[PDB]
Amino acid sequence: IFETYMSKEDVSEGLKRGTLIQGVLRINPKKFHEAFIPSPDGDRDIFIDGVVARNRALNGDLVVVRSAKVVYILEKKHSRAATGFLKLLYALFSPSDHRVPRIYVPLKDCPQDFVARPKDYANTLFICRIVDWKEDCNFALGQLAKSLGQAGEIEPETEGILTEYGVDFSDFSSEVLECLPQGLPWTIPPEEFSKRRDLRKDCIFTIDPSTARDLNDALSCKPLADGNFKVGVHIADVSYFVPEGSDLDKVAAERATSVYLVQKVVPMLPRLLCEELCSLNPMSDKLTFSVIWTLTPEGKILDEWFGRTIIRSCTKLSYEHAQSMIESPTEKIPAKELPPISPEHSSEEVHQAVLNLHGIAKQLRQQRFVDGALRLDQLKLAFTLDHETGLPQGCHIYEYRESNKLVEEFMLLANMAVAHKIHRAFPEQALLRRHPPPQTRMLSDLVEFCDQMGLPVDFSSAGALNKSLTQTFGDDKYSLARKEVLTNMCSRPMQMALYFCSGLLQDPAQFRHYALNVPLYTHFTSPIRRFADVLVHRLLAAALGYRERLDMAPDTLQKQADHCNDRRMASKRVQELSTSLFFAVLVKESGPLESEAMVMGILKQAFDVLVLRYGVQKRIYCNALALRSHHFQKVGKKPELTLVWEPAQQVITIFSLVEVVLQAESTALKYSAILK
């Protein structure tokens, strides 16, 4: 039995006075009896003990409240749905996630076969929605939605996590497709040859991954007569095809971002706009919102010009061909291994252009990292799948080659220029991004860990952290894995970047983006994938005088920014769970996997390893080992584990190389790591 809520008047009086604290509660996934809310001042996170003192609040909900109890909930931000197995002791519903409680389902809603034949529905996934939670029941009451399929397959589990996080994957209604342009061979109206600059004769190319349906940007470089370069970044304008107030705009605001999975993509726009009308496919006249600079070979801006233009791309490179033409500076690459090119242009022009853009991008990278920019890069693996069955065949870690940096530098230049322009035009309504500095309290724990063990790292500033992480060790077989484990330890106290409106924050200290070490930043180069990009596009168009001033209030922009923030968070969590699902299926269908590992932590009966080939973090317990004995020691707050397997002995401490094997178990989506 819980305790009843407080009325609105008391909550308003308490909040205005300052006796009550609002926050977004975070629940530990591994232990569900404890919860945490952030302090307003910036002190240690306020602890919430018990399950009773959470008082029917779920993870992600914002509440109004040293150990404390939750007494009021303003906004319910959780989706209130879960994927679980159906059992008996009404009927009981058990979710896979342990933060959602256990749910009662009425026996009228259950299928007829289930009451007669319970066993045959013992490995089937069901989706249930919580509708009400009583004051006298420890279990919520729910409604059964549908039958997903067999547990452990690919499509039932994918649709289960998409519905559990709230991503709307349903098809577009016809009132959305009625706002699209009509006519199958759409062409540019002849009235746009006067409001736009004609760039159809220049050399324009795109560099995006080979498996990319939609293209958001194009690049160009032209050498001048005094040793300078004219460098242009051209973005497909989705604000021409998305009018304000139409049902297309309401749907695109409803889903802030598009979600990328292992096997498919859940889009933001209709497929016509995402693939044919707006994406910069080669050999077609397209409308773009370009930025054009004149740069020195050292990467210094001498001119800047914004404006609407018309382009015609000549080729579509990938991240694989671009490295070939970078790594062949003085040798003609044969045309057999190149994508098709428009007949007006030659492969020499494109080949020369990639070299010049790489030459500028190297010096821009060096100058940005002298200025203090920080880069914490973890491991991102990519799969190779079966075309017909749809099961994964094999994984390999993605490789961040030079061509992935050549594009990234120019996207940063375009974003910084657009941020300056739209902030200097409208100071009271502008959408910008911000990265706070990391929290000092839980940076201090990393300070006290790394001050020992003879490791000279410092967390005073971002540039200091980057130079410390790079100079101390490199170019050794153990040192690269050492770099990976230190990066994984360092990436934990960092905060997440936020969208915000410039008319509500008062002081100019908050605006600066910490990790890039710049005072102003925004998102302008990906309209098809995000909706904040479309808002920035409209604001920039209003600033240059192409249209009238936005008729949107500065508080509605804050509400829209909060919605885009929560949607981005849900998108990142969904991609993480999809990658984990496909890796578990690969381990089950490819036998035991052998690799090496480094110990990242030690405990009395367990220790954490990091598998070097795959980058996952499993846990290894001494109960599963075939050992005679084990002893735990600590000296100078340094853990040590001694294993007795005349038998031999092994000593394992932090940053020790072991050999591990991954083996699937009888459960559908589980595996285990065992020492070899």
Numbering used by the authors: 49 to 113, 231 to 254, 265 to 820, 828 to 858
From the article:
Dis3-like 2 (Dis3L2) is a 3′–5′ exoribonuclease that plays a critical role in human development. Dis3L2 independently degrades structured substrates, including coding and noncoding 3′ uridylated RNAs. Unlike a number of structurally similar homologs, Dis3L2 can degrade structured RNAs independent of external helicase activity. We determined the structures of an RNase R/II family nuclease bound to a series of structured RNA substrates and analyzed the kinetic profiles of wild-type Homo sapiens Dis3L2 (HsDis3L2) and engineered mutants to reveal how this nuclease achieves highly efficient degradation of structured RNA.
To understand the presubstrate binding state, we used cryogenic electron microscopy (cryo-EM) to determine the structure of RNA-free HsDis3L2 to 3.4 Å resolution (construct Dis3L2D391N residues 1–858: carboxy (C)-terminal truncation of residues 859–885; and an engineered catalytic mutation of Asp for Asn at residue 391 in Dis3L2). RNA-free HsDis3L2 has a vase-like conformation in which three oligonucleotide/oligosaccharide-binding (OB) domains—two cold shock domains (CSDs) and an S1 domain—encircle a funnel-like tunnel that reaches into the Ribonuclease B (RNB) domain and leads to the active site. The overall structure of RNA-free Dis3L2 is very similar to the structure of the mouse Dis3L2–ssRNA complex (MmDis3L2–U13) (root mean square deviation (RMSD) = 1.2 Å, calculated over all Cα pairs). Thus, the apoenzyme is preorganized to bind single-stranded RNA (ssRNA). The vase conformation is the only one observed in the RNA-free form and with long single-stranded 3′ overhangs.
